[PDB]
Amino acid sequence: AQPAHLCFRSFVEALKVDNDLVEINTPIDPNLEAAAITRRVCETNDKAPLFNNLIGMKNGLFRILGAPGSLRKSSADRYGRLARHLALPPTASMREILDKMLSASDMPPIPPTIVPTGPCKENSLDDSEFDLTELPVPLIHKSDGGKYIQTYGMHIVQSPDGTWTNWSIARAMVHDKNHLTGLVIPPQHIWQIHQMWKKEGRSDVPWALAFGVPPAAIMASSMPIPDGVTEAGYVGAMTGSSLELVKCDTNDLYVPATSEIVLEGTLSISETGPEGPFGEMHGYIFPGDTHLGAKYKVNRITYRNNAIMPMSSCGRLTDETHTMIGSLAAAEIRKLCQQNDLPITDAFAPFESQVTWVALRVDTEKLRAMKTTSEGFRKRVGDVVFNHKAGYTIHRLVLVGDDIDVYEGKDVLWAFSTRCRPGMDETLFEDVRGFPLIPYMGHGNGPAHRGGKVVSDALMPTEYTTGRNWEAADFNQSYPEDLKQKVLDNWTKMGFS
Amino acid sequence: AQPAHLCFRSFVEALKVDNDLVEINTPIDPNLEAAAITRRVCETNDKAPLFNNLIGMKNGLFRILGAPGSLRKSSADRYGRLARHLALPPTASMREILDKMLSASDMPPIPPTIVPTGPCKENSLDDSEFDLTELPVPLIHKSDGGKYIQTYGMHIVQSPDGTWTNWSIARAMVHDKNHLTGLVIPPQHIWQIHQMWKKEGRSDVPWALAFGVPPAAIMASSMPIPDGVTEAGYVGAMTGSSLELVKCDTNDLYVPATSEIVLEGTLSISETGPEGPFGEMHGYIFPGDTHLGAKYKVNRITYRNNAIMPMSSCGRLTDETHTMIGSLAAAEIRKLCQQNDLPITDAFAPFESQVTWVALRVDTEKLRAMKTTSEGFRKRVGDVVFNHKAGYTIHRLVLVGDDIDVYEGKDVLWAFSTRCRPGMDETLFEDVRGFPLIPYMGHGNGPAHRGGKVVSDALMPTEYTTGRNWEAADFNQSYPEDLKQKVLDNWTKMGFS
Ligand SMILES: Cc1cc2nc3c(=O)[nH]c(=O)nc-3n(C[C@H](O)[C@H](O)[C@H](O)COP(=O)(O)O)c2cc1C
Numbered sequence: 006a007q008p009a010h011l012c013f014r015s016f017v018e019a020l021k022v023d024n025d026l027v028e029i030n031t032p033i034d035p036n037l038e039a040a041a042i043t044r045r046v047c048e049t050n051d052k053a054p055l056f057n058n059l060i061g062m063k064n065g066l067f068r069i070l071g072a073p074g075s076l077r078k079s080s081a082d083r084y085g086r087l088a089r090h091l092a093l094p095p096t097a098s099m100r101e102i103l104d105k106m107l108s109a110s111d112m113p114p115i116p117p118t119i120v121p122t123g124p125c126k127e128n129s130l131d132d133s134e135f136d137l138t139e140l141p142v143p144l145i146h147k148s149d150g151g152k153y154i155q156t157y158g159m160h161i162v163q164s165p166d167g168t169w170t171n172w173s174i175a176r177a178m179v180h181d182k183n184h185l186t187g188l189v190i191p192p193q194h195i196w197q198i199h200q201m202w203k204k205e206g207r208s209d210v211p212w213a214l215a216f217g218v219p220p221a222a223i224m225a226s227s228m229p230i231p232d233g234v235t236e237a238g239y240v241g242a243m244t245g246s247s248l249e250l251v252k253c254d255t256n257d258l259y260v261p262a263t264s265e266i267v268l269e270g271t272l273s274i275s276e277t278g279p280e281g282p283f284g285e286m287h288g289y290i291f292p293g294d295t296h297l298g299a300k301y302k303v304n305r306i307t308y309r310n311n312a313i314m315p316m317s318s319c320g321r322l323t324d325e326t327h328t329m330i331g332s333l334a335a336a337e338i339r340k341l342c343q344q345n346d347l348p349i350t351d352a353f354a355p356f357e358s359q360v361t362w363v364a365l366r367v368d369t370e371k372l373r374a375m376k377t378t379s380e381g382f383r384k385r386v387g388d389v390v391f392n393h394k395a396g397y398t399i400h401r402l403v404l405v406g407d408d409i410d411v412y413e414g415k416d417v418l419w420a421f422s423t424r425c426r427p428g429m430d431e432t433l434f435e436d437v438r439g440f441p442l443i444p445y446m447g448h449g450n451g452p453a454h455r456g457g458k459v460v461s462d463a464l465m466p467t468e469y470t471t472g473r474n475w476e477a478a479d480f481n482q483s484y485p486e487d488l489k490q491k492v493l494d495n496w497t498k499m500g501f502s
Numbered sequence: 503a504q505p506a507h508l509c510f511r512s513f514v515e516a517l518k519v520d521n522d523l524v525e526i527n528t529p530i531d532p533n534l535e536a537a538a539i540t541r542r543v544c545e546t547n548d549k550a551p552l553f554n555n556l557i558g559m560k561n562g563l564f565r566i567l568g569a570p571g572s573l574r575k576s577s578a579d580r581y582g583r584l585a586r587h588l589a590l591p592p593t594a595s596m597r598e599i600l601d602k603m604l605s606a607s608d609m610p611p612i613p614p615t616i617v618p619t620g621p622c623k624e625n626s627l628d629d630s631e632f633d634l635t636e637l638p639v640p641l642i643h644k645s646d647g648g649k650y651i652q653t654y655g656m657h658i659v660q661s662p663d664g665t666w667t668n669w670s671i672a673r674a675m676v677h678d679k680n681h682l683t684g685l686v687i688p689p690q691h692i693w694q695i696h697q698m699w700k701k702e703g704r705s706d707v708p709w710a711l712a713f714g715v716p717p718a719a720i721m722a723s724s725m726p727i728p729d730g731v732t733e734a735g736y737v738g739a740m741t742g743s744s745l746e747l748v749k750c751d752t753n754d755l756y757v758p759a760t761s762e763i764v765l766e767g768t769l770s771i772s773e774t775g776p777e778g779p780f781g782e783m784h785g786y787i788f789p790g791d792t793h794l795g796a797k798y799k800v801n802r803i804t805y806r807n808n809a810i811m812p813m814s815s816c817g818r819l820t821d822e823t824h825t826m827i828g829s830l831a832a833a834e835i836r837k838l839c840q841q842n843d844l845p846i847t848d849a850f851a852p853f854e855s856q857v858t859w860v861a862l863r864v865d866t867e868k869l870r871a872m873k874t875t876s877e878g879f880r881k882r883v884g885d886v887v888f889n890h891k892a893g894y895t896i897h898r899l900v901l902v903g904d905d906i907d908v909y910e911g912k913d914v915l916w917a918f919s920t921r922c923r924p925g926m927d928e929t930l931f932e933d934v935r936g937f938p939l940i941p942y943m944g945h946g947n948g949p950a951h952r953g954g955k956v957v958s959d960a961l962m963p964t965e966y967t968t969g970r971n972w973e974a975a976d977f978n979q980s981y982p983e984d985l986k987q988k989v990l991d992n993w994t995k996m997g998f999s
Pocket residue numbers: 156157171172173174175176177188189190192193194195226227228229230317319325326329330
């Protein structure tokens with residue numbers, strides 16, 4: 006069998022054909038080595054590593070693919086892995102990736118198709134035959150509090166009433182032979198659904214975790230699509246085809262047919278266990294910071310022959326926690342603003358900001374017609390975004406006018422630094438949900454779960470009134486066209502590079 | 503001849519030997535073309551252009567050297583032009599450049615030596631023989647309000663009492679055949695001295711403007727060394743040799759003997775004229791924003807045979823306004839903090855911030871012994887720096903701990919973004935002098951000359967108490983040494999770049 010965006014195995018082959026894979030066929034240790042290689046790949050934008058000979062792999066469990074959604078070295082196909090998740094050309098721009106991820110938002114869902122089997126059923130291990138401590142689960146960072154099996158798989162949970170089935174990524178580590186512990190925190194949909202089952206109080210939550218799912222599905226799993234929306238039908242609509250699912254053996258949830266590895270079991274409504282610390286998206290680990298997390302019981306494993314586990318070695322720039330979490334949040338915030346009648350054209354979370362900022366490009370013609378002010382406009386934008394789930398992970402919003410390409414961090418930093426007067430041009434939001442994972446939040450001076458947010462207005466005064474009143478002091482804007490072309494045409498004759 | 507740091511002509515030759523020069527011997531227009539080529543060089547870190555055939559050059563006035571203090575493409579000799587100003591190896595780090603610029607601060611001055619002639623006296627034009635509108639003065643940006651002769655020369659003014667002779671860079675444009683207009687603004691030393699002469703009220707200020715001075719001298723001219731300190735003696739001390747000066751023909755000021763071009767005349771204590779707009783350091787020009795500036799009368803020109811005028815085409819990254827203004831201010835702020843008993847080890851103005859921020863590296867062992875808090879420490883640092891001239895051009899200070907290399911913008915941005923909680927971890931300063939050239943100041947929503955400053959504390963809580971409590975989630979810190987070296991040693995065997 007199938008296309009790369011619909012089948013993870015095909016996706017691996019696509020990375021190979023792209024000359025974007027390195028297959029490592031000698032033995033590699035899942036204790037730190039695989040993740041160290043992965044981390045270095047992410048820091049240097051190298052090819053994705055496929056570990057075909059992992060120390061501890063037994064009976065087909067498992068190979069690892071690192072850096073599945075990380076950056077390539079070239080400018081021209083920078084985002085090519087992300088484009089391979091989506092059937093887009095590998096030279097796709099981030100605007101085009103994010104528009105593809107948003108395209109299903111005003112389409113009818115395409116619900117999924119149930120099929121009686123698939124590759125994910127090629128092998129199975131019951132509750133007497135596996136031990137999660139005996140699989141080659143990686144230790145990703147040297148201070149991690151456990152072996153994090155789950156960095157890039159898909160949790161599947163369903164509302165008690167059956168009407169919403171959510172797919173999302175949330176980390177989890179091995180607790181013991183048949184349990185994991187993981188993050189399940191508000192306002193995430195796995196948490197929202199968990200709360201529904203705990204209020205009902207009758208049973209633990211039926212659960213599955215599918216690794217190596219269809220790449221289109223893992224991207225939606227990382228996106229804050231709306232409350233109540235079933236990701237399978239959104240992915241269906243986005244890709245134009247109904248996803249094929251197979252029922253779990255031990256519960257009534259449905260998993261992608263071509264999933265590499267499937268865990269089936271339950272998410273407890275009563276039990277917790279030690280979880281963390283972990284080397285997280287903002288670039289840190291706090292050794293010894295263990296806290297109680299949600300507890301999962303695993304009842305069954307099913308898997309493809311020669312199964313491959315994807316793994317994100319996350320931390321400092323650049324990995325999936327930046328390219329997918331930040332960009333996909335930004336996409337959804339762009340739509341959210343437009344649906345609130347705000348004149349936002351584009352949004353992106355600058356990597357430079359460790360994806361804690363989102364830059365919002367403003368249609369200043371529309372803003373002018375509003376006949377508003379910075380104070381009022383900043384307040385309106387921050388109230389929309391920081392009161393919504395899509396804004397959770399974002400602590401600063403930077404408003405910029407039409408001359409700025411929000412997908413270019415250098416230009417966002419320029420505009421922030423030169424057009425937003427500290428204090429006066431900003432509004433602080435202390436009574437909104439904060440993201441505790443940011444070190445200044447959970448390890449900072451104030452409440453870990455509240456406040457610490459700001460809207461920074463990098464619109465100039467005349468952008469609200471009569472129009473931009475400057476030209477940039479750059480080659481593009483400070484010279485006439487004919488002169489610029491002469492200069493360019495004579496550049497190498499004169500002796501330049 | 504003489505050494506490059508003491509003779510501009512030799513400096514040009516040094517750039518040639520370095521394969522860091524392009525000599526353009528075909529005719530180039532000073533109306534925009536020279537500056538467009540220069541601007542492109544600055545935006546791309548290319549070789550410095552030497553325009554040997556400038557349209558309008560007559561009787562030896564003049565050639566142009568663009569981008570004299572801009573960046574080279576290579577990491578290894580990035581700051582090599584700056585090192586060629588100072589007799590440093592071309593691979594010098596910015597720490598080593600700034601330490602060289604600070605080294606004279608606790609040395610006896612070496613006063614200058616008067617010599618009876620020099621190259622700058624090879625040619626002269628009296629008050630009947632030159633016309634500044636007839637020289638090939640550049641139009642640097644298409645919207646500039648005049649032809650800016652003066653971007654990288656040295657103004658020379660002396661206190662009425664004779665005790666302080668100041669050298670500094672401040673822009674100036676041609677007003678008419680025998681006058682310039684320029685910026686003379688508080689708290690700059692040219693302004694301080696001008697105020698002394700206006701209070702005396704007896705005469706205009708004797709003045710000289712020397713272009714193509716000794717490179718060591720132009721660097722000190724761009725540095726905020728202390729009030730009352732004569733730059734010639736500081737440069738003497740920094741270079742270990744007494745600078746040779748020659749007296750002006752028409753006044754009693756002394757100019758470097760090897761100056762390429764010298765204007766002699768007066769800075770008016772009563773007259774003003776239109777000045778600006780200009781494409782400035784923060785990357786903008788506001789067309790039509792002309793204001794009254796200081797007025798200079800030119801009485802005489804003297805110049806070297808085959809004189810060369812240096813020119814800064816300034817604007818967006820990277821030019822002399824960033825590499826020299828920002829870095830040299832940062833240097834002086836590092837010293838200022840240390841002399842105020844603050845535990846600052848290093849300071850740099852990130853280019854990413856358009857040199858409007860300075861990151862201050864804190865010796866956190868010393869900070870711990872202080873037994874203080876963020877609120878108190880931020881207040882103490884901002885009061886020191888924002889109440890001083892060295893802090894003028896800087897609107898945000900970012901305090902970072904010992905793990906951050908302040909000379910690496912990516913690391914400053916990481917620490918700012920992840921360790922400083924907006925609002926709570928910052929202190930705003932509204933009753934300090936502001937820098938009006940920043941667009942958010944002079945073209946912003948608030949007072950152009952006051953406030954808009956902030957100290958942003960990117961120290962984590964335990965950096966004040968018991969010590970850093972994290973490890974970075976990066977290759978360097980999240981893996982043991984033996985493993986990292988294995989990975990590195992096997993990198994290209996495995997198939998990576
Ligand atoms: C590599 C990676 C790791 C992630 N880790 C977590 C995590 O541990 N906890 C979490 O709630 N979200 C995590 N996310 C982000 C969520 O997947 C994202 O917020 C998504 O919107 C959640 O789905 P939902 O909107 O259906 O709740 C991770 C995403 C990626 C790409």
